[PDB]
Design a protein around this ligand. Structure first.
Ligand code: ADP
Ligand code: ADP
Lengths: 578, 579
């Protein structure tokens, strides 16, 4: 518990406004609930992925509603911390909790990890957990008409809470705390790196927000902490050898770009610990080879999914939309314009077909990194047959159901050429019947990537019932300008100096103790000959063959990283490409 | 179980010692640096690795080493799910009282040994009795109130059996892989266990023990030194094993020789041999003439494939010693460009070793896996896939590849590929090929397959065409004349020995003291040349298995007459056998 105000939470302004409403307006403006015979909303259920800001929202509601002109007291009970081996002493300890929260009315109650305290309806296990959920229903249903007991509940899996506790009288509003996008991760990184003695450039924070996809709110905090710790390790290492306190001085500890870029390589986000990785953007080496034809593949995805407009809820908040904008013949016209706004999506399908090894694993990852607000459901082989209990049928059906719950979704099938051979025809037809039983306005994009997929399989074959009619994009091999830029990026390492490479040198003097209180020869005929042989050898090559040539020439270049006579390196590059 | 074991007792984990000092000791001494950036220290590490690696030792040494000053650190320790009872109550209540007493004595370390039994994965049935414990653990570790300076350490064999909500910042933000130690760390562990001893061993003997103990963990090295000391006690004073009264011995002249360690290495089966995959070990000294000419070439090929001897970037063994001994030195064009051009040397590391039937592939695979010491070997052989009877083939292949995807220097190892592509189902090869083509180029997952008489038509237009075995096919050719000459020259060196050189043990002339209770060898050099010529001419165009058959068949004849001084009968029997 700290003095966390609401200006230490980034990206959740709408739920901040709704909580400020339900904690201020039924006690500051009481009259407005009489002319409409309505009760104020009583219960709210916070749910979402871990490290998003649920407990931060409860702590900020505790801190902000504690001031001079009004007192609001906070009662917290953790997950199943109220039960004991005594039979009905848990019922006593819950009833007395609501009694002290009732004889007070500054009280608001919070149940962290409600899915362990109040699980689903008990088919077996008629023990004290069912009595706990029955007394919780019977105790928070009503003992006050229009009272002051807001019961906040935090969980990770909201489907594990009892459905009898998810109703319009108890846990009314259900809030989803989403993993932040780029604009919100920018604000979280400014909230963390705010009171530092030397702040960061905003272009660098934009690059950090671009790099940290899949990072929660806690993982950005961990990245900032690890960058500060690497800066303390880099500035004053001598405090890692003494067992007694030394005298170091702050304001020489500045957090550079290298500390963040080294802290990024060791922090895995919580959405990639049991997955291994996250969909990363297109890497900087092969960006000359594929970003000429990824941008087109972005534009089609900007044309069949309506991403760049986002005509519903484009701004930060709904109340801010009522402040800075003016509203507008509302009965037929609203239905008509909402129908024509939602009718811009027919059936989002995309099959990205190319030759073998033409960078499909980069294009799929770059597209899944580009689609920020989408619930990606992977139908690859390593996610379907990973479990030894569920069948391929049940896995495909459950993944499509999770794609149907969270409505902007991407069903993602990489290596469709393998997927139409490993997966039997029954599961492909089950997925086809699931995709034909959807409305047209449903935002479930079926994305597919394949290598050497014959069009006879998608126009009259097994995939002919997925409607890949005009939505087949063709990754073709990179052209001569792309290969020229790729190998100019390669050749610029042959031109760099042996003193310009970042070879770390040993310090000639030891570290200070603390108080215990020549131009290389490269004639431009050789560079043009290396350019011409690298262009002529990689004629009609795919991306994997170009990376093979790039690695094979970069080994020869990195062997002579200290030499100045670069003639033998050029001759070995000539000799390899023959 | 919280002894005086500190940080000089652990050997070979010098990188995690710096981070555990960074998150336990250094916040206590320097709170002004952590409050300068408004950062909390990282609190809570999940130790994971093979069993017998040093997790509990690291926890106890963290509890005892940072408490040498007058800033005491209490060490609460919990065995793996010993906290739950037959009722619903005490399982959450005891964790409540544990975290409250850890809150009270504020610098504290809670150590959950074997946390995979306390916080298991949410299964299909039997939800309640573990989810009600996971819920109170998650709500107590990173709750709304400040937990204080409670450093939570968990320890496990595999981290996937822990719940993923625990593997999250604020609770288990750091995950430390404790590796089976390399030869320098095994040297340091052997130096640590043989440090208190009265007659210490030499340096080169500990070096030879560090080479001989490949695959051993730390606990196996401790058991080796314990069994060597016990065999030394059995060798010096046997009579204490027969009396029931305490005899008077002196704890001198009981020094551990080499012959005690050489028996302890036979009494100890390591955790590498208990596994079902191919145990990495060097080429044995018999067949090292036959194969080390064409193993070295493979090493050279791997040195051009994985950049082992070219390590200027990604040399992170210890970042703090890197910041101590070295020195720093626009921003993108000096770091990111050169890191990309150093990572862009690994394109697609594959290697298919293909020789005739019986040409020593079971030795070449283990020797390559011994050479790749800093790699993570994941065996995709048949026995490791079918050994876990609950898993399927597909799930085991996907699990091994996903374990190889993390800890990125890794080797996916398929021995007996000719058996593998004939007995694994056809969809599993496509699953593995889709997992390999869904990798980036710069990922160091080497695919190492060894095969016996595999057709090139199967890797050209077959079911292994989607693995890119184009240039990376190495042919183990049959061993040449000089290798066979050196092999049988060692055999001949066995033949021309004297029976006084052949080690026969003793029969002692006097019994042990009770304790106070409280000819010339006739073998002409022409016969040696005849036997060597017959061994060479008989083993024409043979493999390693046929050469070992001939070697065993001749070694039996030589060890028949190991006491005879007239070696003409055994030469006649050797020449009679090879006809
Ligand atoms: N939306 C956010 N904005 C800023 N910081 C956040 C946000 N979400 C989480 N954090 C950081 O994460 C920590 C709290 O997250 P946590 O309470 O662990 O969420 P949850 O309970 O959902 O896992 C705080 O230290 C805070 O700095
Ligand atoms: N890295 C190491 N350095 C020194 N000794 C070790 C190391 N690893 C293990 N040991 C020895 O092995 C013994 C048992 O280790 P243990 O705590 O059982 O590890 P784990 O819990 O991982 O099996 C310890 O008493 C220790 O002396």
């Amino acid at each position: 518990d700290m003095n966390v105000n609401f200006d230490d939470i980034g990206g959740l302004d709408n739920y901040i406004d709704q909580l400020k409403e339900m904690v201020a307006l039924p006690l500051l403006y009481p009259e407005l609930y009489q002319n409409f015979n309505i009760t104020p909303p009583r219960g709210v259920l916070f749910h979402g992925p871990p490290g998003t800001g649920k407990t931060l929202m409860a702590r900020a509601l505790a801190a902000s509603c504690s001031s001079d002109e009004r007192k609001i007291t906070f009662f917290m009970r953790k997950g199943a911390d109220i039960l004991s081996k005594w039979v009905g002493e848990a019922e006593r300890q819950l009833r007395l909790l609501f009694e002290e929260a009732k004889k007070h009315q500054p009280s608001i109650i919070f149940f962290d990890e409600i899915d362990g305290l109040a699980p689903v309806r008990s088919s077996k296990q008629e023990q004290i957990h069912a009595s706990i959920v029955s007394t919780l229903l019977a105790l928070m249903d009503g003992m006050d008409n229009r009272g002051q007991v807001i019961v906040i509940g935090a969980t990770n899996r909201p489907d594990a809470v009892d459905p009898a506790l998810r109703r319009p009288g108890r846990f009314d509003r259900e809030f989803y705390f989403p993993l932040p996008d780029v604009k919100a991760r920018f604000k979280i990184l400014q909230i963390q790196t705010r009171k530092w003695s030397s702040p960061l450039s905003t272009n660098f924070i934009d690059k950090l927000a671009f790099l940290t996809k899949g990072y929660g709110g806690a993982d950005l905090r961990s990245l900032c902490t690890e960058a500060a710790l690497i800066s303390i390790q880099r500035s004053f290492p001598q405090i890692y050898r003494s067992n007694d306190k030394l005298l170091v001085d702050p304001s020489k500890i500045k957090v550079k770009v290298s500390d963040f870029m080294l802290a990024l390589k060791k922090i895995v986000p919580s959405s990639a610990r049991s997955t291994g990785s996250s969909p990363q953007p297109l890497p900087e080496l092969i960006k000359p080879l594929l970003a000429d034809q990824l941008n087109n593949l972005k534009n089609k995805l900007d044309y069949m999914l309506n991403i760049k407009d986002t005509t519903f809820q484009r701004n930060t908040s709904l109340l801010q939309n009522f402040i800075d904008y003016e509203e507008y013949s509302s009965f037929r016209s609203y239905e008509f314009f909402e129908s024509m706004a939602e009718s811009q999506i027919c059936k989002p399908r995309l099959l990205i077909n190319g030759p073998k090894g033409n960078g499909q694993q980069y294009v799929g990852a770059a597209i899944l990194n580009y689609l920020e607000e989408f619930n990606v459901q992977n139908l690859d082989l390593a996610s379907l047959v990973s479990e030894s209990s569920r069948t391929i049928e049940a896995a495909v059906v459950q993944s499509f159901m999770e794609a149907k719950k969270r409505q902007p979704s991407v069903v993602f099938i990489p290596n469709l050429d393998i997927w139409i051979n490993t997966i039997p025809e029954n599961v492909i037809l089950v997925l086809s019947g699931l995709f034909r039983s959807l409305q047209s306005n449903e935002k479930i994009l079926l994305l597919c990537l394949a290598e050497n997929l014959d069009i006879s399989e998608v126009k009259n074959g097994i995939l002919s019932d997925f409607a890949f009619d005009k939505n087949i994009f063709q990754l073709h091999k990179p052209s001569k300008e792309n290969i020229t830029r790729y190998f100019s990026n390669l050749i610029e390492l042959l031109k760099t100096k042996p003193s310009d490479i970042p070879m770390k040198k040993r310090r000639v003097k030891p570290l200070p103790e603390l108080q215990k209180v020549k131009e290389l020869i490269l004639t431009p005929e050789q560079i043009k000959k290396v350019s011409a042989c690298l262009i002529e050898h990689c004629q009609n090559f795919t991306v994997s063959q170009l990376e093979d040539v790039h690695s094979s020439v970069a080994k020869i270049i990195w062997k002579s990283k200290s030499a100045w006579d670069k003639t033998g390196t050029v001759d070995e590059i000539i000799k390899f490409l023959s």
